[PDB]
Amino acid sequence: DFAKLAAAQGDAIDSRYHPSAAVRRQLNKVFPTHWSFLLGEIALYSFIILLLTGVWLTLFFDPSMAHVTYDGVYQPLRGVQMSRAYETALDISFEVRGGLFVRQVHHWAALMFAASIMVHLARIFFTGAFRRPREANWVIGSLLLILAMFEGFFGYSLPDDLLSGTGIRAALSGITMGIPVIGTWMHWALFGGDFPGEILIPRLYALHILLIPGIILALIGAHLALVWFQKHTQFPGPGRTETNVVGVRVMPVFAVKSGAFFAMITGVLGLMGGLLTINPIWNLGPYKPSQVSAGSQPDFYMMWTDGLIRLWPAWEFYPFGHTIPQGVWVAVGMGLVFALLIAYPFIEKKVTGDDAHHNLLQRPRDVPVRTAIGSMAIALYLLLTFACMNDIIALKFHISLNATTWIGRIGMVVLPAIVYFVAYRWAISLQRSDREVLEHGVETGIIKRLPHGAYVELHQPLGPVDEHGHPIPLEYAGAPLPKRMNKLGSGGAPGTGSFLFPDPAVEHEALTEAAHASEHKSLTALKEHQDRIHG
Amino acid sequence: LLSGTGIRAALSGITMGIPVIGTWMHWALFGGDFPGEILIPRLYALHILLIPG
Amino acid sequence: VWLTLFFDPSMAHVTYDGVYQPLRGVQMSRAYETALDISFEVRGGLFVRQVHH
Amino acid sequence: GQPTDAELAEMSREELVKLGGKIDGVETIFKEPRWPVPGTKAEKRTERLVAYWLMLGGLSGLALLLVFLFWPWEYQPFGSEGEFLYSLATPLYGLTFGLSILSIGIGAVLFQKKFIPEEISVQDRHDGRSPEVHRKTVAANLTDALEGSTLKRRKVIGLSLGIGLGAFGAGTLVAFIGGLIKNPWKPVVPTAEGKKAVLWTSGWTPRFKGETIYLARATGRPGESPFVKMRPEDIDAGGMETVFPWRESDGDGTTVESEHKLTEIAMGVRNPVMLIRIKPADMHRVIKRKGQESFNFGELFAYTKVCSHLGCPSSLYEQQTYRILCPCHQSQFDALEFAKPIFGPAARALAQLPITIDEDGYLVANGDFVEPVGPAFWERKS
Amino acid sequence: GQPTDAELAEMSREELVKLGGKIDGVETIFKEPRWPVPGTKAEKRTERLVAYWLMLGGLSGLALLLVFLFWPWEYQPFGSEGEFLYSLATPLYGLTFGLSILSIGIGAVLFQKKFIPEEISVQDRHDGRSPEVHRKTVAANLTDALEGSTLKRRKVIGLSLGIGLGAFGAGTLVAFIGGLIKNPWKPVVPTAEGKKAVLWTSGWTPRFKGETIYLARATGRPGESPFVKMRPEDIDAGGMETVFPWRESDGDGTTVESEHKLTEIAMGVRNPVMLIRIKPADMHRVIKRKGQESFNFGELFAYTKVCSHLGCPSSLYEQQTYRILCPCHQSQFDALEFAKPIFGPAARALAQLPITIDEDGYLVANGDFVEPVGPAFWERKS
Ligand SMILES: CC(C)=CCC/C(C)=C/CC/C(C)=C/CC/C(C)=C/CC/C(C)=C/CC/C(C)=C/CC/C(C)=C/CC/C(C)=C/CC/C(C)=C/CC1=C(C)C(=O)c2ccccc2C1=O
Ligand SMILES: CC(C)=CCC/C(C)=C/CC/C(C)=C/CC/C(C)=C/CC/C(C)=C\CC/C(C)=C/CC/C(C)=C/CC/C(C)=C/CC/C(C)=C/CC1=C(C)C(=O)c2ccccc2C1=O
Ligand SMILES: CC(C)=CCC/C(C)=C\CC/C(C)=C/CC/C(C)=C/CC/C(C)=C/CC/C(C)=C/CC/C(C)=C/CC/C(C)=C/CC/C(C)=C\CC1=C(C)C(=O)c2ccccc2C1=O
Ligand SMILES: CCCCCCCCCCCCCCCC(=O)O[C@H](COC(=O)CCCCCCC[C@@H](C)CCCCCCCCC)COP(=O)(O)O[C@H]1[C@H](O)[C@H](O)[C@H](O)[C@@H](O)[C@@H]1O
Ligand SMILES: CCCCCCCCCCCCCCCC(=O)O[C@H](COC(=O)CCCCCCC[C@@H](C)CCCCCCCCC)COP(=O)(O)O[C@H]1[C@H](O)[C@H](O)[C@H](O)[C@@H](O)[C@@H]1O
Ligand SMILES: CCCCCCCCCCCCCCCC(=O)O[C@H](COC(=O)CCCCCCC[C@@H](C)CCCCCCCCC)COP(=O)(O)O[C@H]1[C@H](O)[C@H](O)[C@H](O)[C@@H](O)[C@@H]1O
Ligand SMILES: CCCCCCCC/C=C\CCCCCCCC(=O)OC[C@H](COP(=O)(O)OCCN)OC(=O)CCCCCCCCCCCCCCC
Ligand code: HEM
Ligand code: FES
Ligand code: FES
């Protein structure tokens, strides 16, 4: 009697505790059903998969520089001195059932985590979800992005590899020693000595499996709690206002679709871990200061920092008996990048004057200057990433390596400007298109007038039509406009039988008019609620 | 010496004496015989992240 | 957290060659070696591990 | 406007759901089932579709279990029967797992989009500026806690608590971080000129005056005799060889005392050097640095491999251009001239090792680098 | 019974605190200040007392800082000038830190107990069985979510989702734990009788038929020649020596190839053995096991050190009692008889190594243990 068991368990729960009101509030919480609001969930799900795979990895990983000869199964690396970290990474890859798959899905989850964090940041920035109520949310999310970047750095640096080791040597060691007053001291504190200090990988292992994941988990908890209680913002729409949330309740629909989305994201990541090879360390010999490779790139989320290193033009200053190497330039650049990213909402409000409580998102077209600035920043980030990749770009796409370096150097001040101008004008022209639709109706096929030979596109008005043909223009309300009669009530009733065979006409008619009734009922309910809010 | 002797007693002997799956639990925890080269890394994971979490 | 910043979990055998004279040239694991390093060659490391225990 | 003391008994499920929405500030508008018409076969087809997706997920999960437990996993040497099975083993694990969970997710999404009823529930958002009753009551509670405590009236306690907390925090933070803080300039590395700091000294620093440091070539032999003495004749015009600072005392790796000295030589960050043979025809284009004019032994030039910018090895030697390129950040150093950077982030030249030949003709270092060799840092160029 | 729309403006702090308590179900009774009478000098003394405690905390925190920054820390070898300072270095760190924070805590407690007003606030506890409105509305919401979803009507979906989730769960859990699972009976250790399991084989198992396995004494020499061949004359009546299975191929630890075989010998769990010289007077009290009657060489008996119960070494030896005691759990084995347990948790006798002397008189195992030597397990005694 599962129904009786459920009832008895509910009564016992509500007697021991009293979660009825709280649970009802959680279940009844309404979440907007916009697709772009799942971008953060992608990052959350990738993070969960990262935790689950990282536990498995830590069950088999040994962090240490203790030198050992492999003497494993992988023949191409036998008798070669390597760190125990590399040896156990190879053991995970080869000598544990499914360890290669687990580590590959872990790395793919890391890449998807960074990518989805970037996409979510783009969504919120361009939609203006950081304004008065949620600047703190933006700030903690920026800290979260920085932590994710650096944890991925430490994660692919954990198995001491040739690629990851040379990346560490460059970024960490060089840029740390570069810092003027405390650079060498920071280097010695972090590595416990010179660069190959025998505590580096244990320290990174701790930072990567316990410390940084703990901070990220706490910050994700704060992030999700803030989103939960500062009810999720929404785009302007029929019944959507600054003081309501139009969407679906948590329990019946949102919970089911979020769980299913998590399942599908897990499936995508597992499929990638299977079919796509990620970081094949066995091809990469154990780290040695002398051995190198041509590629020498970090993961894509640090590729922009590496590209900054490459592109910045070797400007070194030599104060009285001292040196200020080119690494400090990039250190300051990264500092500026993070500072501006964290402080943008406050910069935005200082610049514009907006101190209003904003609960309705802005369309990126509707906010041109911010959209232009975001496009400019994305262009700069892409230029830096492809500059880091300039080695492989030059190799495959036959471009001189010097040519790619200087393309990056010039474009990091030219391409941002071009993209800013283009994005600003593009946003304004999207606004112009929206107003054209508002004032003339949707466009359709052309018709030749009866008496004379005029051609008229035979538009379709979206609002009340004047006594004559031309309609009364509507007022823009911040919501997208249907520019195709495709997406309106036109040409949308295929035979509802099946792909290969029809259904009885009675069934088809019943279904089609039932759907018509349901959709017009939804439209009428939204219209009535909209009229009720002010009217 | 002290703590490794304690491990050898409890974790190894007790685990490996269990009738149906004792040796199987021992080998799966230690990655093989008692002094298996993964015991302390596994305990480190368990002790800094997994169990404290 | 402080201890993890200095501890190295591994059975990888090493001769101490550290500061504690009574154990010098003796085969030991990296775990033991770094615990000794915390005790002796890290300022306040002995205190931190003792207050931890 | 009443809590429905006894009407809940006869209130139906729909009425109770509406009441809950009302209490929570949620008004459910157009909660309509997906299949109002009963008995239609489109409903059965959609049912079968979601069932097929869920069953595909289950079959793929069973496939994951069967392949995981029973498949030729385990590395297979090159060109051996079973290599193909091993190569597509992990792909099969990932394919089965991902397909299973993805199909389950697709089935769940289809159930939500086809069977779970459609709603446009609208929740009243009470964001911002809690009602004045709550605000003023919280303010009163906090202010009463602060003032009643009699703080901001015991000046001595106010200052003493601040001093105590500040001193304790200072002591605790300093004791937390002093374990990590180390002096980079503590003289530790022994040298002919007494113990010196690590950054100044590399494997090429003479431990005692007049020590012989051979430019030993690092044969890839796994462990035994990894470094072997080198002769000028071994290199030929337009050739580069990575050499290391090997000492007679640092004999082959057969012993245990050795194979730690050799490991230290191999792992020395500032140790590896590139010995390049400048072509005799191109020897006339060489421009030499101050104090490094006699460093080259005839047409042999020894430059540190460590890039002068962030310290990656600069191994990519290009002959017929005499350019030592670094792969980490694409910086070229003109080997013909003193190895000065003529492109890329680097701004300082690579340190040039003084080389010569000892008795028996083997290549040896004729001294130490006249400058620190790794990447630059604050305490440099003086 | 009204929310005080505009009364809050003139409501005082006490009234607002009472209102908040009322809203939260909290009635603050007897919230009285500690010092109603003003100007008294007992108040000043108590103020100064808490101030003194906080100032002691601050002074001790500064002491922690100064001691940590400037104290003769670092190990001092032994009987060395500075050894006394080092010995109380860490105690001083702990003393200063603990005293500082303890004094801060004492000051805070005294401030709470002497200056913060005393209250006996009583909160209304609404535990158990949320009001029927909430219970029934939650039940209605959950039941509407379940039934409206149309589940428990699509038997094909109900069963397919269960099958899919179960199959995926089982694929995933098996694929998680399967990496860890290893057959303890995979024949891996080579032996004269082919590869055998690790539990069956020890360091005393002859790798090839007729192999010589000397009972090498483990000298404490740090690294070089750790194991040295042994002779019966070395022990004297009532003597115990820990010996290991040393092969001629496992030469001294000078080479890298050696010092790994030797480390394996030292770290072998089942390798160490105790060789006991039974006193000739007491040789007549010896009882011998089935198949172990000729194992002893004259008055030499070689018993495994690993205790038969949980595998700790049984290193303690009592002569004139001939009792091999295990420190882990206080189990004694009668060495005179076959090393059968005559006390403690152990129930199986220690395995007896056959021993003899080869040419030159060096002690060598005359075979292998006729039983598994470590602690017992399921697959044993057959
Ligand atoms: C710092 C910086 C950006 C310097 C400039 C270097 C650079 C990126 C130059 C452009 C590269 C191109 C597009 C070369 C083709 C020749 C060329 C320049 C034609 C004119 C360009 C132009 C305006 C054309 C008009 C039409 C048009 C837009 C054509 C674009 C054609 C292309 C290539 C579109 C895709 C863009 C693309 C993928 C560029 C390469 C970028 C990267 C990082 C690829 C990474 C990558 C590589 C490198 C693999 O080898 C690989 C092997 C197996 C699986 C996966 C991959 C993989 O993902
Ligand atoms: C103008 C205007 C109106 C401004 C608005 C005012 C404003 C700023 C309002 C917001 C207020 C803010 C930001 C408050 C603080 C928020 C905060 C920190 C809350 C606590 C968060 C929490 C719970 C835990 C802490 C998490 C955490 C680590 C947060 C900080 C995240 C950041 C900024 C990390 C930066 C890391 C970084 C690069 C530091 C520079 C130090 C250097 C140069 C180290 C050397 C170095 C290393 C070590 C590398 O690994 C590396 C790798 C690749 C390339 C280069 C380098 C490199 O140079
Ligand atoms: C060889 C080898 C070892 C292979 C294995 C690889 C490995 C090591 C690890 C991965 C293996 C595993 C365990 C994979 C499965 C992972 C997993 C649990 C998937 C669940 C997805 C699934 C099976 C769905 C079935 C379809 C279905 C009926 C769905 C409806 C019922 C379900 C499952 C609902 C789940 C809801 C859900 C995702 C809850 C997450 C809980 C968390 C952390 C946060 C909740 C939460 C969410 C989700 C928000 O979006 C949100 C947005 C704004 C503000 C706040 C929140 C918020 O608090
Ligand atoms: C994390 C790991 C989790 C575990 C997952 C993995 C577990 C897999 C276990 C199954 C694998 C196969 C078992 C192998 C090993 C095995 O178990 O032995 C068998 C035993 O079957 C029998 O007859 C026993 C029944 C007869 C006696 C009746 C006894 C009743 C007892 C059990 C009642 C007490 C229970 C109390 C519980 C107390 C709990 C304490 C908390 C017989 O030997 P066999 O299968 O031929 O294996 C040979 C080796 O015996 C051979 O020494 C070797 O040489 C090889 O040849 C090998 O192949
Ligand atoms: C407000 C606090 C005021 C105090 C300022 C403290 C900074 C001045 C240091 C004074 C001590 C220096 C002289 C005697 C000591 C000396 O010569 O040591 C030096 C290194 O100084 C040390 O001791 C440790 C330095 C202390 C860490 C300070 C942390 C930063 C502070 C300033 C921030 C927290 C304060 C609160 C403000 C923030 C509030 C929060 C908002 C070099 O070490 P070395 O010669 O290589 O030996 C190594 C051994 O030190 C090493 O501990 C050992 O572990 C080895 O690794 C070893 O090699
Ligand atoms: C419902 C699931 C039904 C499936 C039952 C699974 C148990 C039967 C195993 C069938 C495979 C055995 C024959 C082929 C395979 C074979 O011979 O391998 C053996 C070991 O079997 C393995 O493979 C891994 C065993 C699988 C783990 C199963 C985990 C427990 C399950 C039963 C519980 C989860 C299921 C869901 C129920 C719970 C729901 C939650 C409420 C011995 O390994 P070995 O010869 O030493 O080599 C080592 C390599 O295995 C090793 O992976 C490698 O990592 C090395 O370390 C290597 O040395
Ligand atoms: C990849 C790209 C790089 C990354 C880009 C992200 C960084 C943030 C982006 C842009 C910031 C600069 C915006 C442009 C600032 C406008 C200047 C001005 O002249 O002020 C006029 C305003 C309107 O006044 P109005 O009554 O609307 O009348 C209309 C009058 N014509 O005045 C004000 O309130 C504001 C006065 C001063 C505001 C200070 C803002 C900057 C604060 C420092 C933060 C760092 C800045 C980094 C810059 C890159
Ligand atoms: C939170 C975000 C995380 C990110 C972005 C991340 C990223 C990465 C990446 C990219 C790798 C390289 C894997 C490879 O090269 O095969 C890695 C390795 C590793 N990760 Fe993480 N990780 C995260 C969380 C975790 C957690 C929570 C744990 C522990 C529970 C963990 C444990 C490990 C271990 C042990 C390794 C080394 C395994 C190996 O070398 O193959 N990671 N990480
Ligand atoms: S690391 Fe060599 S040029 Fe930058
Ligand atoms: S360990 Fe020897 S008696 Fe228990």
Distance B9 CA to ligand 4 centre (A): 22
Strands, E assignment, A198-291:
244-246, 248-249
Q: H/E element holding A448?
A: strand A447-448
Neighbouring-strand partners of residue A81: A69
Question: Which among D104, D222, D348 has the least Cβ separation from residue A263?
Answer: D104
**For this experimental structure, what is the resolution in angstroms?**
3.0
Name the closest residue on chain A to residue C13, using Cα atoms.
A66
- Say how many C-beta atoms besides its own lie within 10 A of residue E158's C-beta: 14
Neighbouring-strand partners of residue A442: A460
- Please indicate whether, in this complex, the C-beta atoms of C11 and B37 are within 8 angstroms of each other: yes
Q: Which of A282, A267, A263 is nearest to A99 (CA)?
A: A282
Partners of A3 on chain E (C-beta within 8 Å) are none
Residue closest by Cα to atom 22 of ligand 5: D178
Distance from the A203 Cα atom to the nearest Cα atom in chain C, whole angstroms: 5
Torsion angle, CA of E215/E216/E220/E223, rounded to 10 degrees?
-140
d(CA D280, CA D265): 32
Nearest 5°: the CA angle E219, E224, E227 is 40
- Please indicate whether, in this complex, the C-beta atoms of A199 and C12 are within 8 angstroms of each other: no
- Please indicate whether, in this complex, the C-beta atoms of B50 and A62 are within 8 angstroms of each other: no
Of A176, A299, A355, the residue with max ligand 2 atoms within 8 A of its CB, to mutate for a pocket test, comes to A176
Distance D333 CA to ligand 1 centre (A): 28
Partners of E135 on chain A (C-beta within 8 Å) are 14, 20
Q: H/E element holding A407?
A: helix A401-440
The answer to whether E309 is annotated as binding is: yes
> Residues lining ligand 2, CB < 6 A?
A 139, 143, 146, 171-172, 175-176, 179, 215, 219, 305, 331, 334-335, 338, 342-343, 346-347, 350
Tokens for A235?
Answer: 């785009």
Residues 6+ apart with CB under 8 A from D253: D223, D224, D225, D226, D259, D262, E256
Residue D339 · residue D322 · CB < 8 Å = no
Q: At what angle do helices A135-157 and A212-229 cross, to 10 degrees?
A: 150
Residue D376 · residue A317 · CB < 8 Å = no
- Contacts of D17-24 with C-beta under 8 Å, sequence gap 24+, read D17/E137, D17/E140, D17/E141, D17/E144, D19/E133, D19/E137, D19/E140, D20/A24, D20/A28, D20/E137, D20/E138, D20/E140, D20/E141, D21/A28, D21/D121, D23/A24, D23/E133, D23/E137, D24/A24, D24/A25, D24/A28, D24/A29, D24/D123
E362 close to D (CB below 8 A): no
* Pocket lining: D346 vs ligand 9, CB cutoff 6 Å: yes
d(CA A493, CA E283): 105
- Please indicate whether, in this complex, the C-beta atoms of A101 and D268 are within 8 angstroms of each other: no
d(CA E60, CA D290): 58
d(CA E82, CA E77): 9
Name the closest residue on chain D to residue C2, using Cα atoms.
D176
Distance from the C22 Cα atom to the nearest Cα atom in chain A, whole angstroms: 22
- Contacts of A371-376 with C-beta under 8 Å, sequence gap 24+, read A371/A126, A371/A423, A371/A424, A371/A427, A372/A420, A372/A421, A372/A423, A372/A424, A372/A427, A373/A420, A374/A122, A374/A125, A374/A126, A374/A423, A375/A419, A375/A420, A375/A422, A375/A423, A376/A416, A376/A417, A376/A419, A376/A420, A376/A423
* Pocket lining: E176 vs ligand 6, CB cutoff 6 Å: no
* Pocket lining: A226 vs ligand 3, CB cutoff 6 Å: no
Name the closest residue on chain E to residue C36, using Cα atoms.
E75
Ligand 3 atom closest to the Cα of residue E165 is 23
Residue A305 · residue A170 · CB < 8 Å = no
Partners of E182 on chain B (C-beta within 8 Å) are 27-28, 31-32
Partners of C2 on chain D (C-beta within 8 Å) are 176, 179
Question: Helices in A59-199 by DSSP H: which ranges?
Answer: 84-94, 99-127, 135-157, 162-168, 175-178, 183-191
In the block, residue with structure tokens 């030729």? D72
The answer to whether A405 is annotated as binding is: no
Tokens for D223?
Answer: 């462990």
Residue count of chain C, please give it.
Answer: 53
* Pocket lining: A240 vs ligand 8, CB cutoff 6 Å: no
Residue contacts between C and E (CB atoms, under 8 Å): 35
DSSP 3-state of D50: helix
Instruction: Write the Ramachandran bin of A511: left for phi over 0, alpha for psi from -120 to 50, otherwise beta.
Output: alpha
d(CA D105, CA D111): 10
Name the closest residue on chain B to residue A63, using Cα atoms.
B41
Strands, E assignment, A247-398:
248-249
Q: H/E element holding D326?
A: strand D323-326
How far from chain centre, in Å, is Cα D86?
29
DSSP 3-state of D304: strand
- Please indicate whether, in this complex, the C-beta atoms of A27 and E179 are within 8 angstroms of each other: no
- Please indicate whether, in this complex, the C-beta atoms of C29 and B43 are within 8 angstroms of each other: no
Distance from the A64 Cα atom to the nearest Cα atom in chain B, whole angstroms: 10
> Residues lining ligand 1, CB < 6 A?
A 383, 386-387, 389-390, 392-393, 396-397, 399, 404, 407-408
Partners of A70 on chain E (C-beta within 8 Å) are none
Name the closest residue on chain C to residue A214, using Cα atoms.
C1
How far from chain centre, in Å, is Cα E42?
54
DSSP letters spanning C1-53: -TTTTT------EEE--SS-TTSSS-EEEHHHHHHHHHHHTSTTHHHHHHHH-
d(CA A258, CA A88): 36
d(CA D56, CA E194): 47
Residues 6+ apart with CB under 8 A from D171: E61, E62, E63, E64, E65, E68, E96, E97, E100
From the CA of D311, the nearest ligand is 9
Q: Is E84 exposed, middle or buried (0-12, 13-18, 19+ CB in 10 A)?
A: exposed
Question: Which among D121, D271, D382 has the least Cβ separation from residue A30?
Answer: D121
Name the closest residue on chain A to residue E141, using Cα atoms.
A24
Q: Which of A53, A252, A81, A291 is nearest to A155 (CA)?
A: A53
d(CA E140, CA A47): 35
C interface with A, Cβ–Cβ < 8 A, is 1, 4-10, 12, 14, 30, 34
Three-state DSSP string of chain E = CCCCCCHHHCCCHHHHHHHHHHHHCEECCCCECCCCCCCCHHHHHHHHHHHHHHHHHHHHHHHHHHHHHCCCCCCCCCCCCCHHHHHCHHHHHHHHHHHHHHHHHHHHHHHHHHCCCECCCEECCCCCCCCHHHHHHHHHHHHHHHHHCCCCCCHHHHHHHHHHHHHHHHHHHHHHHCCCCCCCCCCCECCCCCCECCCCCCCCCCCCCCCCCEEEEECCCCCCCCEECCCHHHCCCCEEEEEEEECCCCCCCCECCCCCHHHHHHHCCCCCEEEEECCHHHHHHCCCCCCCCCCCECCEEEEECECCCCCCECCEEECCCCEEEECCCCEEEECCCCCEEEECCCCCCCCEECEEECHHHCEEECCCCCCCCCCCCCCCCC
Largest CA distance in chain E: 110
Residue count of chain B, please give it.
Answer: 53
Integer distance in angstroms from the first to the last C-alpha of chain E?
85
Residue D166 · residue E58 · CB < 8 Å = yes
Question: Which among B8, B13, B28 has the least Cβ separation from residue E181?
Answer: B28
Residues 6+ apart with CB under 8 A from E333: E303, E308, E314, E323, E324, E325, E326, E339, E340, E341, E342, E346, E349, E350
Partners of B17 on chain E (C-beta within 8 Å) are 310, 375-378
- Please indicate whether, in this complex, the C-beta atoms of C46 and E90 are within 8 angstroms of each other: yes
Neighbouring-strand partners of residue D244: D216
Q: Which domains does chain A have, with CATH numbers?
A: 2-430 (1.20.810.10)
Q: At what angle do helices E132-148 and D13-24 cross, to 10 degrees?
A: 110
Tokens for D174?
Answer: 């300093």
d(CA D377, CA D310): 10
In the block, residue with structure tokens 């079919």? A275
- Please indicate whether, in this complex, the C-beta atoms of A24 and E138 are within 8 angstroms of each other: yes
* Pocket lining: A100 vs ligand 3, CB cutoff 6 Å: no
D14 close to E (CB below 8 A): yes
Residue E251 · residue E376 · CB < 8 Å = no
Tokens for E253?
Answer: 């630890």
- Say how many C-beta atoms besides its own lie within 10 A of residue D338's C-beta: 21
d(CA A200, CA A168): 10
Distance B51 CA to ligand 6 centre (A): 24
Q: H/E element holding A223?
A: helix A212-229
Q: Is B14 exposed, middle or buried (0-12, 13-18, 19+ CB in 10 A)?
A: middle
In the block, residue with structure tokens 């004694």? E332
Question: Which among E100, E107, E160 has the least Cβ separation from residue D54?
Answer: E160
Q: H/E element holding D24?
A: helix D13-24
Question: Which among C26, C40, C51 has the least Cβ separation from residue E222?
Answer: C26
Distance D136 CA to ligand 3 centre (A): 41
d(CA D319, CA A437): 65
CA atoms within 13 A on the CB side of C32: 18
Residue A299 · residue A114 · CB < 8 Å = yes
DSSP 3-state of A83: strand
Q: Technique behind this structure?
A: cryo-EM
d(CA D75, CA A95): 8
